[PDB]
Amino acid sequence: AAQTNAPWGLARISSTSPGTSTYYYDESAGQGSCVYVIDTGIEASHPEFEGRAQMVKTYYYSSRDGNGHGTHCAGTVGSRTYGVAKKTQLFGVKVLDDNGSGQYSTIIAGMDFVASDKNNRNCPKGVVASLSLGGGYSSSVNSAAARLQSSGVMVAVAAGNNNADARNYSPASEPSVCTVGASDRYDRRSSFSNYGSVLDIFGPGTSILSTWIGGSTRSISGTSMATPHVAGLAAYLMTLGKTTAASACRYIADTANKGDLSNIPFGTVNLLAYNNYQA
Ligand SMILES: [Ca+2]
């Protein structure tokens, strides 16, 4: 399948080179997979989600996304125009309030929720969780991320936006999950992207167009935006049967574009998520 004039991130994920604008992907498109977006929620009524999005949990007085961040992220995972996995099922877990803030205890609870809740969902091709959030190092937060992964969920987490080593952030520093740095459309490490040995992969994160609340769209930037590219990629690869929740981060690293990013600090992986799709 070919989607012309796609957001640059989508085009990049299916390309061996920067500077193209068509997104190429197998038409299976993550059908039969599920992706949990653990964030400010998802505006499920957005036309871009086509009925494939649902709020399953909130820790606040509403499950509505009163922010937009969670909706943007979900849109990159699986919206029809802005998504990597255009046929995946999207589940929203609101651990962040409408200011984008959340106590670590609520974040942990949301992770443990998804680890159980996948048993209440129909996801024959496999389960992914996208966590575009973080804060300072916490062993409890990392442990929760490690549980969710161990349970059979491909966990993708943002490296963080401090232009700093991600070892000092959580869940970014958890070894057993997929930690995702950000790049721009010129294959530069995004200026705000964290780095370090704990990173597993890079995805597009600068100037990323996706869904927003009020049924709109916008371009914003962050390792928050890179993460859902990787989560969507994992869902897509799982429906194709190429990989599984346990091995998908390795598989993505294995099949990544290698050595192509600039301003990657010494000792950080130079790997850019790539679907290796041959149209
Ligand atoms: Ca990791």
* Dihedral sign computed on CA atoms, order 129, 52, 182, 269: positive
DSSP letter string, 131-152: E---EE--HHHHHHHHHHHHTT
Beta bridge partners of 272: 202, 257
Closest CA to 130 of 166, 81, 96: 96
Going from the Cα of 128 to the center of ligand 1, the distance in angstroms, rounded, reads: 15
Identify the active-site residue in 46, 69, 72, 229.
69
Angle at CA 83, nearest 5°, toward 81 and 87? 95
Going from the Cα of 4 to the center of ligand 1, the distance in angstroms, rounded, reads: 33
Write down the H helix ranges in the chain. Answer: 8-13, 69-78, 104-117, 139-150, 223-239, 248-255
Going from the Cα of 159 to the center of ligand 1, the distance in angstroms, rounded, reads: 9
Among this protein's residues, is 176 annotated catalytic? no
> Structure resolution in Å?
1.9
Closest CA to 212 of 107, 96, 104, 76: 76
Among this protein's residues, is 191 annotated catalytic? no
Q: Position of tokens 């700093």?
A: 164
Among this protein's residues, is 69 annotated catalytic? yes
16 annotated binding-site participant: yes
Going from the Cα of 66 to the center of ligand 1, the distance in angstroms, rounded, reads: 30
Write down the H helix ranges in 121-205. Answer: 139-150
Query: Which amino acid does the sequence have at 2?
Result: A
3-state helix, strand and coil shares in percent for the chain, rounded to the nearest 5: 25, 25, 50
Return the structure tokens found at 228.
């859902």
Identify the active-site residue in 14, 15, 33, 39.
39
Going from the Cα of 51 to the center of ligand 1, the distance in angstroms, rounded, reads: 32
> In order of start, what are the domains of the chain with their CATH numbers?
1-279 (3.40.50.200)
The string over 144-159, giving b where at least 16 C-beta atoms fall within 10 Å of a residue's C-beta and e elsewhere, is: bbbbbbebebbbbbbb
The string over 256-273, giving b where at least 16 C-beta atoms fall within 10 Å of a residue's C-beta and e elsewhere, is: bbeebbeebeeebbebbb
What span, in angstroms and rounded, lies between the C-alpha atoms of 101 and 133?
9
Beta bridge partners of 55: 92
Note whether 140 and 246 are within 8 A (CB). no
160: left (phi over 0), alpha (psi -120 to 50) or beta: left
177 annotated binding-site participant: yes
Output DSSP code: residue 265.
Answer: P
175 annotated binding-site participant: yes
What span, in angstroms and rounded, lies between the C-alpha atoms of 208 and 146?
28
**What burial class does residue 139 get, using C-beta atoms within 10 Å of its C-beta: 0-12 exposed, 13-18 middle, 19+ buried?**
exposed
What span, in angstroms and rounded, lies between the C-alpha atoms of 229 and 201?
11
Going from the Cα of 179 to the center of ligand 1, the distance in angstroms, rounded, reads: 5
**What burial class does residue 30 get, using C-beta atoms within 10 Å of its C-beta: 0-12 exposed, 13-18 middle, 19+ buried?**
buried
Residues with CB under 5 A from ligand 1 (ion): 179, 200
Quickly count: other Cβ atoms within 10 Å of residue 189's Cβ: 23
The CA R_g of the chain, rounded to the nearest whole Å, is 16
Going from the Cα of 199 to the center of ligand 1, the distance in angstroms, rounded, reads: 6
